Each structure stands twice: as C-alpha cells, then as structure tokens.
Amino acid sequence: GVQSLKRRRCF
Amino acid sequence: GSSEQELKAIVKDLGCGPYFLGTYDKRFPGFVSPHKLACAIVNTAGRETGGVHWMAFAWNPRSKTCYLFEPFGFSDQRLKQVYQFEYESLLRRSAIASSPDRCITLEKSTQSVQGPNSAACGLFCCMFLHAFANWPQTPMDHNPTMNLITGVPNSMLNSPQVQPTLRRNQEQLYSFLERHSPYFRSHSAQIRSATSFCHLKN
Ligand SMILES: *C(=N)CNC(=O)CNC(=O)[C@H](Cc1ccccc1)NC(=O)[C@@H](NS(C)(=O)=O)c1cccc(Cl)c1
Ligand SMILES: [Zn+2]
C-alpha cells in the first residue's frame, strides 16, 4: 500500500 | 471518472456501510464522531463544479487518528496548487468535536498509487475504505487489501519507469473490485471505461 506521514495536530 | 452513486454502491458492497457518512464536496465539515469509526468520500471541488477529484477521509476514535487517502499522494501545498483544496478546517473541527483533548494524529499518504492519466481516483478510495473498515489501526499499508497495491514516490508520478507499477495497481484494483463488489461486477465494462488508466488521453 502506501507510505504515510503522521502529524500530531492539537487545537 | 466515477459518480457519487457508483462510489456509494461500491462502498456499501465492500462492507463500509456502518461507518460511511456519504460522498461530499470539498465543504465536508469534518467528523463529529467521538465514539464511533467514521469515513467519507470527499471531492477536492465544490458541487457547483460538477466535481473534480476524489479523496477519502477516515476517523478512528480509539487512536484519535484522522486518515487522509488521496491517490496521487500530493503534499498539502500541492493539493492547494493543483486542486485548490485545503482541509485545515475539517481537521480543526474533527479534533474539537471528536478528541477528548482536542489533539489528533493526521496520517496521510505520501505516494501515488494511481497513474497521471487515470480516472480511477474514486475507486482507489473505495479500496482504501475497505482496508479502513477491516483494519482501522492500519489502513494505509500492511493489510490484506492495501498490500495488493504499491505506492511510488509522488515525485516520480510522471516518470516512465513507475508507469507499469501504476498500471499494475489499476489492474489489481479492478481484480479486487470484481471479487468484492456485486455493483462493479454488473457494470464492469462501463466503469472500466469511465475510469481507465488512459482516460484523460481520450
Ligand atoms: C479521479 N481520478 C477522477 N475524478 C473523478 O472521478 C471525480 N468524479 C466526479 O467528480 C464526478 C464526475 C461525474 C459526474 C456525473 C456522472 C459521472 C461522473 N462528480 C459527481 O459525481 C458529482 N455529483 S453528480 C454531478 O453526479 O450529481 C459530485 C458529487 C459530490 C461532490 C462533487 Cl464536488 C461532485
Ligand atoms: Zn491507452
């Protein structure tokens, strides 16, 4: 399948 | 490419029905789903447009992860440049509505599975959403569904060396849909034509 990137986002 | 009605039927056949919110235009608000798996198919363009390109968004409350699966795997900058698409509000609203601490992980694909002239984006979406409904902790890769296709770096989208791979992704996708979807089976010839690897060249 695909490489992915993980980003932590806080609001 | 694919209509909304087609994607709706296909998603239902693939077992995504209990989690699937619908098909929407670029104005999809985000997830209000603190206690349930949820997913949607989202156009990069407004409905007034007729529609341009499909992506899938999915939400897993257990890991607080919002998935973005866009088949070319464009960077955020490139999504805005190529399709005028931004999703910052949808993420914000999802986080605020659905995460107990207002924090999530955005996991997004960074590779293309689809060829540059292909109109199969809708269908690659359905396939990703099959993966998500069965393996919600690991829908991008390392699962029986997504293992059938191969990402190439987005920078190589137009290189002639990756084209047979991007084509083989497409054939695997159609094989996948033959075996999993009564709808695709009974419209096989039409859908293949409307979505073909070469479609933007007719
Ligand atoms: C991917 N590589 C190729 N791109 C697409 O398949 C995008 N497809 C669409 O946007 C379809 C185009 C279409 C229109 C009619 C019949 C078949 C295919 N757009 C829609 O389905 C459109 N709804 S409609 C015009 O069928 O009522 C639509 C639905 C939801 C959102 C948006 Cl922005 C448009
Ligand atoms: Zn051709």
What topology does this entry show?
The complex is a heterodimer of chains A (11) and B (202).
Chain A: E1 4-10
Chain B: H1 4-13, E1 20-24, E2 38-43, E3 54-60, E4 65-69, H2 76-83, H3 88-98, E5 103-109, E6 111-112, H4 121-134, E7 152-153, H5 163-180, H6 182-186, H7 188-195
Parallel strand pairs in B: 1-2, 4-5
Antiparallel strand pairs in B: 2-3, 3-4, 6-7
Q: Main traits of this protein?
A:
heterodimer, A: 11 residues, mainly beta, 0% helix, rod-shaped, B: 202 residues, alpha/beta, Adenoviral Proteinase, Chain, 5-stranded mixed β-sheet, two-stranded antiparallel ribbon, 7 helices, 37% helix, binds the ligand *C(=N)CNC(=O)CNC(=O)[C@H](Cc1ccccc1)NC(=O)[C@@H](NS(C)(=O)=O)c1cccc(Cl)c1, binds zinc ion, hydrolase/hydrolase inhibitor, Adenain, adenovirus
Please give a quick description of this structure:
Chain A is an all-beta fold and 11 residues long. Chain A contains no helices and 1 strand. Chain B: One of its GO terms (molecular function) is cysteine-type endopeptidase activity.
